[PDB]
Design a protein around this ligand. Sequence first.
Ligand SMILES: [Cl-]
Ligand SMILES: [Cl-]
Ligand SMILES: [Zn+2]
Ligand SMILES: [Zn+2]
Lengths: 369, 369
Amino acid sequence: DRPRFSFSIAAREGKARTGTIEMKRGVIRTPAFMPVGTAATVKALKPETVRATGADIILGNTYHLMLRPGAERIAKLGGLHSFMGWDRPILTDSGGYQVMSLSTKQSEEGVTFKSHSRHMLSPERSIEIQHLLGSDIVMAFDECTPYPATPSRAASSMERSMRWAKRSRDAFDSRKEQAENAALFGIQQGSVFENLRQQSADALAEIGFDGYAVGGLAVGEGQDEMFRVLDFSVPMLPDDKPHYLMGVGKPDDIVGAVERGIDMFDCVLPTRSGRNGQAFTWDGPINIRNARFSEDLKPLDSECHCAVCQKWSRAYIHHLIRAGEILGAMLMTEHNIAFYQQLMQKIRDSISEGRFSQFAQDFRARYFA
Amino acid sequence: DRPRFSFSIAAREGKARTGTIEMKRGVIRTPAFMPVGTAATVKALKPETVRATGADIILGNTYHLMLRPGAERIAKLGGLHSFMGWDRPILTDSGGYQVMSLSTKQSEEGVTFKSHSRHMLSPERSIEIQHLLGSDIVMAFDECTPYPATPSRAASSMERSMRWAKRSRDAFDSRKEQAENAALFGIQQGSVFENLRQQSADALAEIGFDGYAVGGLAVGEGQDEMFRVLDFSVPMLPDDKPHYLMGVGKPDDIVGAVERGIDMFDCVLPTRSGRNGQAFTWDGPINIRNARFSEDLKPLDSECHCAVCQKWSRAYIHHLIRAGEILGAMLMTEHNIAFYQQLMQKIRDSISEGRFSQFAQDFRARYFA
Ligand SMILES: [Cl-]
Ligand SMILES: [Cl-]
Ligand SMILES: [Zn+2]
Ligand SMILES: [Zn+2]
């Protein structure tokens, strides 16, 4: 039987790595893209369809689930895996970003907030909620510093996050069933400042985690600045553990982040923008609602292997999205998630074959033509 | 290869019949339930899922399709079957009911109307639209008399419908490809009046059709009155052709209509009410949004063989519908359509085995317990 957690790097090219995370509930191929399952569903997809696109792991949102249907309720019903019908690994966010984005009174103990009923979220309660959900990869409870941030405020926020990271570690370790069956990732903060990123990486490595997220990015800084911060931030993390870039991103963001040593990604872009009419293609995104697609018999993308591109035309999906039909959301979302997984597969294969630099160049030349 | 049209009755019990309609695109088992595909989609279901529930044929709506995406456009794209990805028979309504329900100036030539742009619908144009869509079963263009109707107005409406039935017949026959590959059904009118129903049946039989619909029912008269009208109306139609009750209905309506000689049904109830939270069960309908289901781990129905009842709980579907999640609509709709098909299968098997009367009694005793 598989271990609780084992990350193995099979091949490297520059800072890029490809390999596997083995966990009780399954193997995760890296670099990995995690479809987002906000309220115990990857929107508009059955779990079997999520798996058919190639996903090895999905992300669940602690903040939404603790409000509806409730963490204790999900536990009483058998846990999130049974509840939604996904039997493979689930990574849960901690709620720290979402509570400040969607709900508040912050203190050293945690955050109290009103639902959008009053609720509480501390490091200890976040880890407990993730236990009740039955998460496989638990995220430490942190604070995502707003951008831009002054050096003083970025430092204060990062320092509190590091104290909360130790509290998260101890809460996780004090629950035997969780410690033996799940993994715990810590989150690097520090805004765009190299010295704070270094202090944060050092604090997290001293505590010790199964994986390390780069937090606090994709919050308005733009790709050039995000890449500049990744350039110095990823090498600060332990090389032998997974590196997770939270909330990223567009296809070109993913490619460049892999070039900088990132192993894991999540984003609502393929699901949310799919429902809004944006389809990803190797020649760049298209908006299927545009009148130019009304009689276009071609599939969404000319090479995509997904079931949507095997059967239905742009013209049909254009009609469905314009009409507000649920099937339009279903088909756009399946295609976009499949596109993301095909991107990850091409990334993994090209690193394994020592041709990822050429892949990145070819990808960009065509995607932005 | 299959014929254009052949209806064969394999078994009978009282007025009930079971058999098959063979058409170019497939075999239809009768009594049959047709899921409704309004705007070129059975809402929230891929065609493969519609087929997996047991459907042999679906209904398409001329009125909606002629407005969006347009009949000529669908023809240019290869027809409705190719467009939506359903390769089996499709019956299309004529637009006569929907134009008066959703859009008007009526005359002997047809109906002119404004979309909800001005448009026209005559017997000739309706048959042409259904040809452009590539319909397998074409409905004559008629007028669904409102209920209640005075005898004079019901007579005038029925008489016009019979003139339009002859125009529909001639338009269909004058298009060689349509006449050779599709079938044409006529629609009996006459409101609740036996003498008008008889005159209408006689006029339709003189013209001659491949099947005969009972129109003008399920328009507010209630089940007792609907059944009373069916009691005398169905025997007036040719015994050796299918009998189609348009727009019906609830499970108990279907059972009683089969007892009165009906072979075909369509209704938005399983799809529309599924999206609204109503699930059909052998113990009657339930509203999954009710708080009593929040922790209910049982499937929607305890015997149902559908994929939804094999995997997901009432509690999960309750959560999805309360949250407004697309997957909730998908799962409710698949279950409800599968329930309807299982009902039709039990009806067919019980007639074939000479035990339909007992089935109807057992069904009602439990469904209304
Ligand atoms: Cl989403
Ligand atoms: Cl519907
Ligand atoms: Zn595709
Ligand atoms: Zn079911």
